[PDB]
Amino acid sequence: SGFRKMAFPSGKVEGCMVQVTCGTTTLNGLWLDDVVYCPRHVICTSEDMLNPNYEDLLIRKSNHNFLVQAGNVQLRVIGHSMQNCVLKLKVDTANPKTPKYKFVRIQPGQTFSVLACYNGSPSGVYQCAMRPNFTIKGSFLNGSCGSVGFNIDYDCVSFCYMHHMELPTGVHAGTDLEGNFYGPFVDRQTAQAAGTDTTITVNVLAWLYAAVINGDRWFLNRFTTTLNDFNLVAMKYNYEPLTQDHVDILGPLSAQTGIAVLDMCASLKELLQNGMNGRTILGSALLEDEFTPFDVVRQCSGVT
Amino acid sequence: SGFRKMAFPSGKVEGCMVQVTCGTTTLNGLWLDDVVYCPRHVICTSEDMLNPNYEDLLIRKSNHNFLVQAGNVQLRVIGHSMQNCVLKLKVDTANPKTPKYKFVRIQPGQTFSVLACYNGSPSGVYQCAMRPNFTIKGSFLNGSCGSVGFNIDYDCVSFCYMHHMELPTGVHAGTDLEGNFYGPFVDRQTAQAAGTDTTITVNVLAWLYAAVINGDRWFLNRFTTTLNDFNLVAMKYNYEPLTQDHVDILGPLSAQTGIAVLDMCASLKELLQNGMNGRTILGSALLEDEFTPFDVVRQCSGVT
Numbered sequence: 358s359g360f361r362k363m364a365f366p367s368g369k370v371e372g373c374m375v376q377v378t379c380g381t382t383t384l385n386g387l388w389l390d391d392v393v394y395c396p397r398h399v400i401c402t403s404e405d406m407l408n409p410n411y412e413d414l415l416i417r418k419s420n421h422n423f424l425v426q427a428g429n430v431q432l433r434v435i436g437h438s439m440q441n442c443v444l445k446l447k448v449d450t451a452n453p454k455t456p457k458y459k460f461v462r463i464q465p466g467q468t469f470s471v472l473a474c475y476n477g478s479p480s481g482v483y484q485c486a487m488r489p490n491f492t493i494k495g496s497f498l499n500g501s502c503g504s505v506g507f508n509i510d511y512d513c514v515s516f517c518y519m520h521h522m523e524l525p526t527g528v529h530a531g532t533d534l535e536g537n538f539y540g541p542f543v544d545r546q547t548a549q550a551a552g553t554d555t556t557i558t559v560n561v562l563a564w565l566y567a568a569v570i571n572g573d574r575w576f577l578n579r580f581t582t583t584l585n586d587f588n589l590v591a592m593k594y595n596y597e598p599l600t601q602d603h604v605d606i607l608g609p610l611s612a613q614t615g616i617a618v619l620d621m622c623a624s625l626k627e628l629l630q631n632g633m634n635g636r637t638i639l640g641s642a643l644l645e646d647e648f649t650p651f652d653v654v655r656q657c658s659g660v661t
Numbered sequence: 662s663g664f665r666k667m668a669f670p671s672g673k674v675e676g677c678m679v680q681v682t683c684g685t686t687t688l689n690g691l692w693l694d695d696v697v698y699c700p701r702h703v704i705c706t707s708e709d710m711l712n713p714n715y716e717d718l719l720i721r722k723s724n725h726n727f728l729v730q731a732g733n734v735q736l737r738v739i740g741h742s743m744q745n746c747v748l749k750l751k752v753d754t755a756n757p758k759t760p761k762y763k764f765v766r767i768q769p770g771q772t773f774s775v776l777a778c779y780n781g782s783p784s785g786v787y788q789c790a791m792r793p794n795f796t797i798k799g800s801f802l803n804g805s806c807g808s809v810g811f812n813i814d815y816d817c818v819s820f821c822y823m824h825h826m827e828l829p830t831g832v833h834a835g836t837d838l839e840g841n842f843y844g845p846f847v848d849r850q851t852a853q854a855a856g857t858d859t860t861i862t863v864n865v866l867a868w869l870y871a872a873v874i875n876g877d878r879w880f881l882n883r884f885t886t887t888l889n890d891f892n893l894v895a896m897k898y899n900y901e902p903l904t905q906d907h908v909d910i911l912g913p914l915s916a917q918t919g920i921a922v923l924d925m926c927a928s929l930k931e932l933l934q935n936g937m938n939g940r941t942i943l944g945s946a947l948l949e950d951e952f953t954p955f956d957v958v959r960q961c962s963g964v965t
């Protein structure tokens with residue numbers, strides 16, 4: 358028993374991290390097969406970031422200007438191309454540590470592990486959710502760009518995120534591995550609005566089920582609700598509307614606990630309207646939304 | 662910016678995990694050099710756990726009864742010995758993935774990363790603190806025993822914990838890598854009292870400094886306090902007494918923020934006496950105590 362914000366084991370991703378330097382800018386890159394993926398702003402100086410013309414900046418660069426270092430050995434760059442906001446550096450050596458992998462674009466509300474890196478070296482790993490407004494509440498400092506987000510299914514690493522920037526608001530923005538930003542963000546030093554964020558309702562309900570499984574049941578009540586009644590409450594508290602798709606994914610947790618989804622919704626409704634009254638759920642004094650129904654099942658079943 | 666419960670990258674530890682089976686019991690082992698370390702209860706059946714005589718149970722076992730599997734290949738066991746609550750299985754092959762390592766006994770209040778494993782395979786990684794009462798609030802299921810806790814300083818893995826059991830209260834108990842339990846616990850299926858736990862005061866203060874560095878400053882007040890006045894408040898709220906040793910370790914954070922330790926103590930005092938008033942600090946609605954001053958400095962400086 359016990360419930361933790363658990364990240365995937367980061368080993369398969371650590372073996373892919375490299376350092377990419379271009380001019381005086383250094384960041385992290387991801388070496389998979391014979392390609393190194395990194396944020397395209399590696400070609401900019403701080404001065405270029407105000408309004409970069411990446412196409413023009415990249416034209417001044419040749420393969421030999423991109424210094425790629427894996428551990429202590431240098432990689433020979435034989436090709437370079439820009440795909441959206443990422444650069445793909447073709448190297449003459451395939452990464453011997455390349456795991457089975459896929460590039461996936463995750464949906465808002467889904468979770469993933471981030472391996473924060475500096476100078477191509479891993480510093481830490483943490484679990485987070487892609488917010489409904491397509492930002493992540495990460496922990497990243499200058500030089501962390503190129504650090505990636507991922508999920509693992511047995512031996513396959515699904516890379517879903519590459520870190521690019523921090524908004525003036527302190528939240529983080531990045532791309533999928535094809536360089537497409539999640540959200541309306543652009544890789545430019547300009548104040549950018551992240552949308553109104555909302556709470557991931559299906560994840561809070563999944564976490565309430567995890568709480569029941571682990572013994573925290575004080576929040577269970579004698580009430581039930583409807584999807585429409587619950588959504589009136591969700592609207593008021595900036596929770597994303599719950600759909601039958603969300604109820605369907607909660608099926609296994611509802612079956613395991615014997616608590617109908619709408620009954621769990623009524624508990625969530627009372628928690629929203631009354632607060633926690635100074636109590637905690639799974640060691641938290643707020644409603645946690647960074648665990649999907651799949652994460653709860655995985656953690657509660659010990660999937661390796 | 663941003664502050665997360667960050668774990669160390671688990672790669673160096675993943676390369677050490679093996680599966681140990683003895684009779685019908687299977688758990689995790691740690692393969693370092695030519696030795697596999699695992700909980701000694703691997704030799705027990707569920708029936709033996711009520712009151713095991715480990716010395717007598719181990720005498721019925723030979724090297725060939727301990728099946729050690731690393732990935733898909735079998736390890737040949739050439740020696741076995743019991744040291745406190747761990748078995749050391751000498752194998753004929755040194756682990757090629759053995760990192761630079763040390764065995765350390767951590768102090769209560771210190772933090773570490775846990776790589777939860779099942780059947781010798783890693784499932785997840787999370788950061789936790791050794792509680793003042795020598796329990797850990799982990800996330801472990803049956804079969805997780807032998808999963809280890811560790812810290813990493815550049816290339817050296819300091820193993821500090823091996824998971825053994827879950828108390829009837831839902832908290833976890835284990836040993837150092839010499840098999841000495843942290844706390845008064847015994848590896849037996851008997852109800853065991855964990856002491857009264859307390860909040861790790863120096864860690865909460867470290868986390869309040871991390872909050873200031875990251876922009877959360879609403880809790881800062883115009884007050885100061887003394888060590889004696891603060892400790893009267895800590896006593897009342899089951900916080901560990903703050904000592905000059907704790908103030909000394911908080912020096913770097915106090916210097917970085919310009920907030921004297923006793924001034925931060927006065928903010929903590931007001932938070933203890935008034936609560937959070939429905940507000941949050943670093944995304945938490947309670948006072949977090951699982952980040953040491955060293956963790957705050959490491960995360961806020963990007964040490965790899």
Ligand SMILES: Cn1cc(CNC(=O)N(CCc2ccccc2)Cc2cccnc2)nn1
Binds near residue numbers: 381500502522
């Ligand atoms: C040596 N060096 C400096 C840099 C550039 N800076 C960064 O690392 N970040 C921002 C880059 C950026 C700025 C404006 C529009 C787009 C992108 C990423 C970041 C920083 C802080 C917190 N979270 C993320 N890269 N390598």
Ligand SMILES: Cn1cc(CNC(=O)N(CCc2ccccc2)Cc2cccnc2)nn1
Binds near residue numbers: 685686687688702801
């Ligand atoms: C196949 N198999 C079964 C087991 C035995 N069971 C376990 O894994 N645990 C307890 C063993 C134990 C019991 C009583 C006194 C000492 C030790 C560890 C645990 C379980 C649940 C949550 N956290 C930790 N090991 N391998």
